[PDB]
Amino acid sequence: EFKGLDSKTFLSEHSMDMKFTYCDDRITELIGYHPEELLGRSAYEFYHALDSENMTKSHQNLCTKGQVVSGQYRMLAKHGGYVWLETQGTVIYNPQCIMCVNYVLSEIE
Amino acid sequence: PTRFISRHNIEGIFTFVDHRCVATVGYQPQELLGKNIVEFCHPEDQQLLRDSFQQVVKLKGQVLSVMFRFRSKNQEWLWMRTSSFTFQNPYSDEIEYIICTNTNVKNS
Numbered sequence: 630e631f632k633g634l635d636s637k638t639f640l641s642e643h644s645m646d647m648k649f650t651y652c653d654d655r656i657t658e659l660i661g662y663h664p665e666e667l668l669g670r671s672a673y674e675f676y677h678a679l680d681s682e683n684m685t686k687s688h689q690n691l692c693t694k695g696q697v698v699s700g701q702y703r704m705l706a707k708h709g710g711y712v713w714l715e716t717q718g719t720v721i722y723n724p725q726c727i728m729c730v731n732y733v734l735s736e737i738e
Numbered sequence: 739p740t741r742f743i744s745r746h747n748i749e750g751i752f753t754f755v756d757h758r759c760v761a762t763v764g765y766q767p768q769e770l771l772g773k774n775i776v777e778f779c780h781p782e783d784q785q786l787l788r789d790s791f792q793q794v795v796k797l798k799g800q801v802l803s804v805m806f807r808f809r810s811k812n813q814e815w816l817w818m819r820t821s822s823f824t825f826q827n828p829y830s831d832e833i834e835y836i837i838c839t840n841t842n843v844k845n846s
């Protein structure tokens with residue numbers, strides 16, 4: 630068996646410097662991390678080196694436009710390896726934070 | 739900046755609540771889950787909150803902010819700024835749900 634689209638989605642909150650300020654408990658089943666170990670850590674620390682420049686350009690688009698769709702990128706999984714993700718980013722103003730809807734494209738059982 | 743994330747269906751029912759709600763509005767997530775956000779709303783602001791949820795689904799992922807009075811666990815009306823946007827996974831045709839950031843703000 631393999632997980633559905635909703636069971637492969639998790640929410641995350643970030644400050645304007647990309648650091649995690651909140652993470653959905655769902656990330657544990659998908660990528661292995663516990664939300665408490667991600668807090669205060671920049672999301673950039675987890676990107677695959679080949680997705681680095683693309684994610685930088687997407688973050689720059691998210692800041693100028695306020696909303697962005699990342700495209701496919703890899704995130705380093707806790708016990709090694711990388712999962713492929715697709716995020717929808719939205720900046721909350723009145724800039725206060727970035728709300729992310731992260732969907733794991735990889736096959737998760 | 740005391741804020742919490744919530745997720746709602748189109749009718750306003752809380753389907754997900756982030757644990758930072760205990761510090762913001764005094765309730766544990768289990769006390770909000772399955773209930774409608776309009777039930778904790780000040781009667782003067784309920785129609786504005788219902789109309790806001792109906793319009794956030796027509797706004798194609800854009801952010802809709804709404805100010806309203808929320809009845810905290812400690813029985814007080816707190817001013818809340820809720821920033822909402824619809825999300826729908828583009829690989830699917832699931833019904834679009836609403837994601838919110840709820841902050842206690844000053845009305846001054």
Ligand SMILES: CS(=O)(=O)c1sc(-c2cc(F)cc(F)c2)c2c1[C@H](O)C(F)(F)CC2
Nearest residue numbers: 641643647672675687688699704716718727
């Ligand atoms: C919208 S984006 O630029 O694609 C993007 S994807 C993403 C992300 C989220 C995760 F939970 C895990 C992960 F690996 C990456 C983030 C972003 C933003 O740059 C940011 F909010 F600042 C920082 C977080």
